Ligand binder design. Structure first.
Ligand code: PEX
Ligand code: PEX
Lengths: 620, 620
């Protein structure tokens, strides 16, 4: 794509001509525009015609004038608009937009706002600039390349660039006021766009929070009957749900715990009830948060968010206490499920232990029937889970590999019981491997306790992703030395096959490597030197991997295992609330309906008791 | 060498004599010089004669006067010059220089500049001091001993000591102005000398950058038609190339990304094109940087620089994006080379696996021919590489040991195929060892991916240089206890040879050491005590080496593996751009020719798109 503006490269082409006009509006001298209007009238042409624009983009002379503002003012703008009006152009020059795929919908008002020229914005608005044109090119979309997403609207651009005067002028100018309800091509409003450009750094979060609160307070004046935070985009997300999905923890916490006093009190989501010393009791708005409603904040955080700080969101209030009462309500069902799986696995172990050769027989047949029925039940449950987690399936197993393991165990159980009916001998390794998987699957339920559940998070770490990368080097070492030892030992004056030599070389890592002078071999010295070289290289490699893993993991970073265990409990709770595949529970709504003021402002509120001695001592 | 000045040691000798004159010019009283001119006229002698100088160095009385400045002024200087003029000396005393090998070319103007006496500099220049005398002794060269390299010229001395007034006076005095184009004995100009004295500390870098920019701006006035940064020294290096070779990262980054506005705009190498929010688009000068030109900055960084921060240079713009587009253009050739090596190694493994005893036979002969041809091809390619990397060969394999390994593998392959024609049995261990090396050489191509290529940098570290130092102690332990166990076990009431006992003692480190009461030996108690002592000493040594290696490597230093992987990709790209030994590619020039102003200032410019949200938010 060509540059937006370039002092060194002339515009593409893919008497008053285009080059003279562009040079005049670049210099900014209005008196050199004389004769342009007469030339346009003589040739019956307009400034919006393709001959007077950049060929590749459709960038006009007015955008060239705004792109060359000197101290916020270009004197060629108003005479250019006067010439455009006097030429009888049915398409206004202020509303002309670029046509290329990279800068599609880009207009001069966007350039005037981005150049922070309030005078130019006023001059464009006074002459009929549409304040709802959407810059929807690839440069203005959100992706990993060179781009600037701010929404697509001029008001969203003015908000995302921290321009209070431009926002105030656009919202209530008498010519054409901008609407806070206006949406971009994705359905995003200005609050959605502020959530989009939000980062978790303190300065960006402060800017986004200030802009969000100010725009909400002005929406309380300009459109008081409009719920600005209840507007959903094309994904069905509100700004709170969008902040939950994108991992924008700071603005999510600010919206979730928002409190105002006096005026703008209906804009609050947190309402202080009473205080007594270090005890503070508050009411929290549960709208769009409680899992009783479809597509809630909790469901989005658990199953739709990809961000690494999902575990930091679930420990914020009121989410923490709400998930705590849900877990206290469902802990008996959790341990009943654990007891059922223990019974199933015990019968599995008894049946697999007493297999026959390739009253007791009837009991073994009954146990085989029970194993088949339990495998069918688990298979149907896992298939229902993966059907419900349809669209976000890649997000489903990135932290829930036990779902994959349970599905695989049930599939192996059903396959082994099918192969037993066909009387093939391969049912027994399948049954044994499903028994292995079933006993490994019992470690899912360690998350029911704090002591085991936190520890199961502390043990597993980034070792798994580096194990494969070390294994890539180690397998090359193993295969090369194995084929070498097989080739060299074929002549007599140990290593008969590739698998045997590979096993003997793998024995060195477990402390059982045989290292001897193979006197019956012809090349025994070279074989011994190859073994010693392999041992030294493998030990150097193992020391390298240990020290490298030691460098990334020991860094004194504070322990986040408690919040990850809380996130695991939240996922378990939200799955347990749906019931079973054969019996669906009716959802129970949390909180109480309370009137908190006048919009009667009746909301479902959750009461949270907080004790904080240091915070209370700081205000004395 | 004697001291430059010493209040305690008298000058060497290797009526108005030398001692009285030296004491007078040390005290600084001009009225005690009476009778010196008459004595010199009577004896027909001059102050520059060997009788009036230090014997070992040739240091004169004027240098003695300047070395004893009191508050920047010595009153004996002007009468001494008057006596020198009145004596009819054909050699001026101001231009007399020291003659010893340590202080060769040292003059009084250098001492006046180093003493920061602008009055003395003006006094010397007004009386005819040559401002282009070069201090070229061993003290003024650059080496690891006691030295001060500043260039060799008075202007370079004034610049390297941060003396703006002295530089300004030397550049435009009406008596004899110094030239910015003047070069030292190495061809270094003042900008080269500033690059030479540059350090990567912030204060030294700030001083060097300020001096460099000021001298370039004054060269824009004094010699506007002279390209000061295009001057090459005797090594053919410009100041940018010299900064790239010496690892001077700060001044290299400053020169590479230099930008000026308004006046001194032709001195810029970076030209901002357009900005829109956090997006900044700039043009970068590619002169002497692009690898299309011989001896470029990229080639110097990859193959000529010895400094440890080579990987920090390649991640700077515009080098990072340029190397990225080069890699995107050559990645298919990289993986085609990988596929060819995989095919060659697979045929190697198949041929080595199916060797006979010391249609299938014809296929094995064809495979032997293919192995021989591939070995010849790889040998010729590696020989061509080491021929092209002729002068800097020691810099070539300090980070590219795979070149050595590929050459050794090809040599072993050719030697094994030669020995097979001679029908000796030793071809088979050579073939097996070349197979080992060829399978190890496949790990070169892990750098083609980020995931494997970064990890291959993270695993290897300083363990290799400490492994040899630990091995020096461990081999002494092993040999001493081995000869002990062989000597002690010779008498009966296990260890028959040195190699056997060494292997049994090495078995303890791999977890297979045999530790038993050798009841058939006569000295079984002493043998058991020797084994226990060896085990304890070896385990203490291993624990020491593990903890010592743990101390140097775990230090929370930020990971530089990504930049080292980028440097490896840069080396691969620059080698792939030359083509093959049998087919040399034509170089493709990067960037576009654009006019950036008036010197028409036409440069080859590279467009770089940068997104930086925090930097843009800081200016709002
Ligand atoms: C169809 C109508 C008949 C229903 C019969 C009652 C079924 C109870 C189901 C139950 O408790 O589930 C236990 C377990 C499910 O694991 P999970 O979803 O918690 O975790 C899933 C992975 N996250 O599932 C199992 O362990 C398999 C059940 C088979 C053994 C039953 C033994 C009963 C002993 C009293
Ligand atoms: C003389 C005219 C005939 C030329 C025939 C084509 C040769 C292709 C060369 C090639 O792709 O090089 C692969 C490799 C070189 O390694 P490198 O320089 O990337 O890395 C070097 C170390 N850094 O070299 C090899 O692997 C050896 C080539 C022998 C096997 C060819 C198999 C072909 C299968 C299609």
């Amino acid at each position: 794509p060509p540059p937006m503006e370039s002092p060194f490269q002339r515009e593409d082409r893919n008497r008053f001509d285009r080059d003279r006009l562009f040079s005049v509006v670049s210099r900014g001298v209005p008196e050199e525009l004389t004769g342009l209007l007469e030339y346009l009238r003589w040739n019956s042409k307009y400034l919006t015609d393709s001959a007077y624009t950049e060929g590749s983009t459709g960038k006009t002379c007015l955008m060239k004038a705004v792109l060359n503002l000197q101290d916020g003012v270009n004197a060629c703008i108003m005479p250019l608009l006067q010439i455009d009006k006097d030429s009888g152009n049915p398409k206004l020059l202020v509303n002309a937009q670029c046509t290329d795929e990279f800068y599609q919908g880009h207009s001069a008002l966007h350039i005037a706002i981005e150049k922070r020229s309030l005078q130019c914005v006023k001059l464009l608005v006074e002459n009929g600039a549409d304040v709802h044109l959407r810059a929807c090119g690839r440069f203005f979309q959100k992706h990993q390349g060179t781009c600037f997403y701010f929404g697509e609207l001029p008001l969203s651009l003015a908000a995302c660039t921290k321009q209070w005067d431009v926002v105030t002028y656009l919202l209530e100018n008498p010519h054409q006021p901008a609407s806070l309800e206006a949406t971009d091509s994705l359905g995003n409003t200005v609050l959605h766009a502020l959530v989009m450009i939000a980062d978790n750094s303190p300065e960006n979060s402060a800017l986004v929070i200030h802009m969000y609160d100010g725009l909400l307070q002005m929406g309380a004046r300009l459109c008081p009957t409009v719920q600005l935070e209840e507007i959903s985009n094309h994904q069905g997300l509100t700004p709170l749900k969008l902040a939950a999905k994108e991992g924008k923890i700071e603005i999510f916490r600010h919206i979730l715990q928002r409190e105002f006093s006096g005026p703008y009190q209906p804009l609050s989501r947190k309402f202080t009830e009473w205080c007594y010393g270090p005890v503070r009791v508050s009411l929290y708005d549960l709208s769009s948060v409680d899992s009783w409603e479809k597509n809630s904040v909790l469901e989005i955080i658990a199953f739709h968010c990809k961000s690494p700080n999902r575990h930091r969101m679930v420990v914020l209030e009121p989410l923490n206490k709400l998930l705590q009462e849900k877990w206290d309500r469902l802990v008996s069902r959790f341990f009943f499920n654990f007891a059922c799986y223990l019974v199933y696995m015990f019968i599995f172990t008894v049946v697999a232990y007493h297999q026959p050769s390739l009253f007791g027989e009837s009991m073994l047949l009954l146990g085989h029937i029970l194993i088949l029925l339990g495998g069918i039940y688990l298979l149907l449950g896992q298939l229902w889970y993966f059907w419900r987690r349809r669209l976000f399936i890649w997000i489903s197993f990135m932290d829930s590999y036990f779902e994959i393991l349970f599905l695989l165990q049930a599939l192996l159980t059903v396959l082994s019981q099918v192969l037993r009916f066909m009387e093939t001998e391969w049912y027994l390794p399948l049954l044994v491997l499903s028994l292995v998987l079933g006993w490994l699957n019992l470690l899912y339920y360690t998350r029911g306790f704090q002591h085991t559940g936190i520890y199961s998070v502390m043990i597993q770490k980034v070792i798994l992703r580096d194990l494969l990368r070390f294994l890539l080097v180690y397998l090359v070492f193993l295969f090369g030395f194995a084929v070498a030892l097989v080739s060299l030992s074929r002549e007599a004056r140990p290593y008969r096959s590739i698998l045997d030599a590979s096993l003997e070389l793998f024995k060195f890592t477990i402390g059982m490597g045989e290292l001897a002078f193979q006197e019956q071999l012809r090349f025994r010295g070279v074989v011994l030197l190859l073994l010693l070289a392999y041992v030294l290289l493998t030990y150097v490699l193992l020391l390298n991997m240990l020290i490298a893993l030691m460098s990334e993991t020991v860094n004194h970073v504070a322990d986040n295992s408690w919040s990850i265990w809380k996130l695991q409990k939240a996922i378990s709770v939200l799955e347990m609330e749906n019931g079973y595949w054969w019996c669906r529970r009716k959802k129970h709504r949390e909180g109480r309906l309370l009137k908190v003021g006048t919009r009667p402002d009746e909301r479902w509120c959750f009461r949270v008791e907080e004790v904080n001695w240091a915070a209370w001592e700081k205000t004395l």
